Scaffold this active site. Structure first.
Site, PDB file in Angstrom:
ATOM      1  N   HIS A  74      26.496 -42.056 -22.243  1.00  0.00           N
ATOM      2  CA  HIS A  74      26.752 -42.344 -20.826  1.00  0.00           C
ATOM      3  C   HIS A  74      25.444 -42.314 -20.029  1.00  0.00           C
ATOM      4  CE1 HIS A  74      27.472 -37.930 -20.317  1.00  0.00           C
ATOM      5  NE2 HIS A  74      27.066 -38.134 -19.079  1.00  0.00           N
ATOM      6  N   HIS A  76      24.324 -40.682 -17.289  1.00  0.00           N
ATOM      7  CA  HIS A  76      23.785 -39.535 -16.558  1.00  0.00           C
ATOM      8  C   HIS A  76      22.387 -39.117 -17.041  1.00  0.00           C
ATOM      9  CE1 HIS A  76      27.779 -37.848 -14.701  1.00  0.00           C
ATOM     10  NE2 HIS A  76      27.133 -38.641 -13.862  1.00  0.00           N
ATOM     11  N   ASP A  78      21.033 -36.440 -18.012  1.00  0.00           N
ATOM     12  CA  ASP A  78      20.937 -35.620 -19.222  1.00  0.00           C
ATOM     13  C   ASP A  78      20.999 -36.430 -20.519  1.00  0.00           C
ATOM     14  OD1 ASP A  78      23.798 -36.099 -19.179  1.00  0.00           O
ATOM     15  OD2 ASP A  78      24.091 -34.266 -20.346  1.00  0.00           O
ATOM     16  N   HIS A 137      34.851 -38.321 -17.989  1.00  0.00           N
ATOM     17  CA  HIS A 137      33.718 -37.590 -17.417  1.00  0.00           C
ATOM     18  C   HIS A 137      32.940 -38.501 -16.460  1.00  0.00           C
ATOM     19  CE1 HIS A 137      30.153 -35.108 -17.081  1.00  0.00           C
ATOM     20  NE2 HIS A 137      29.419 -36.109 -17.534  1.00  0.00           N
ATOM     21  N   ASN A 168      30.754 -30.886 -13.645  1.00  0.00           N
ATOM     22  CA  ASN A 168      30.510 -31.756 -12.500  1.00  0.00           C
ATOM     23  C   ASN A 168      31.423 -32.964 -12.584  1.00  0.00           C
ATOM     24  OD1 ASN A 168      27.479 -30.397 -12.795  1.00  0.00           O
ATOM     25  ND2 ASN A 168      28.088 -30.823 -10.674  1.00  0.00           N
TER      26      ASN A 168
HETATM   27 ZN   LIG Z   1      27.386 -36.656 -17.389  1.00  0.00          ZN
END
Ligand SMILES: [Zn+2]
Length: 215
Positions: A74, A76, A78, A137, A168
């Site tokens: 994904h 994000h 991180d 998510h 989150n």
């Molecule tokens: Zn994420």
């Protein structure tokens, strides 16, 4: 089970050709290191470039071969954070078109956008399947399946037995997330192990645990 000295990185083994990589940030994220006859394949890199570099250098040295591909689960920070490192070293960064567009919109260099809903990859001897189960998510989260061992990399779509929260949920779709997890359970009815985005490895029980957290 080889850990670095100081820097925050460890590598645990599961099969003769599959290992887990965990890096610290305030939360320790997981990923996969797949040892193939054509090179090393990672399911996700790290938080940023500095960590991603240390990671690549650690496994290349250990396994005596080059990291040739990475699958980003994904968009994000991180997960996409080490994209610059991957791109400059010539390592192929696979992802869906969706993940690719989200990375760009957020200011990151973009992965390949080559993955579909169901993509069948083959790395020399190894076979790897990517699967988009729907939103959870994030809007773009995907899972990775290793048929030769019935292992599933769930990413952040799956929480571990330590997460009492959903984390989150700013970019999450709490309503479709349950249906998405069901898509995974329906597609993979016999899972040997499950690697959550964060936390310890588990089994089918991790998905059911995530479902309860979504209530
Ligand atoms: Zn994420």
């Amino acid at each position: 089970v080889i850990k670095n000295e100081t820097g925050t990185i460890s590598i645990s083994q599961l099969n003769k050709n599959v290992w887990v990589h965990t890096e610290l940030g305030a939360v320790p994220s997981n990923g996969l290191v797949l040892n193939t006859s054509k090179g090393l394949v990672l399911v996700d890199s790290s938080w940023d470039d500095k960590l991603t570099k240390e990671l690549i250098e650690m496994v290349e040295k250990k396994f005596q071969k080059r990291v040739t591909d990475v699958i980003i689960t994904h968009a994000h920070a991180d997960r996409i954070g080490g994209i610059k490192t991957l791109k400059e070293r010539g390592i192929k960064a696979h992802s869906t078109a969706l993940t690719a567009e989200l990375a760009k919109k957020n200011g990151y260099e973009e992965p390949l956008g080559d993955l579909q809903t169901v993509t069948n990859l083959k790395f020399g001897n190894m076979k790897v399947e990517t699967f988009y189960p729907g939103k959870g998510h994030t809007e773009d989260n995907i899972v990775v399946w290793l048929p030769q061992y019935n292992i599933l990399v769930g990413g952040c779509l799956v929480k571990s037995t330590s997460a009492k929260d959903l984390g989150n949920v700013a970019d999450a779709y709490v309503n479709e997330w349950s249906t998405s997890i069901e898509n995974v359970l329906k597609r993979y009815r016999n899972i040997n192990a499950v690697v959550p985005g964060h936390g310890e490895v588990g089994d089918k029980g991790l998905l059911l645990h995530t479902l309860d957290l979504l209530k």
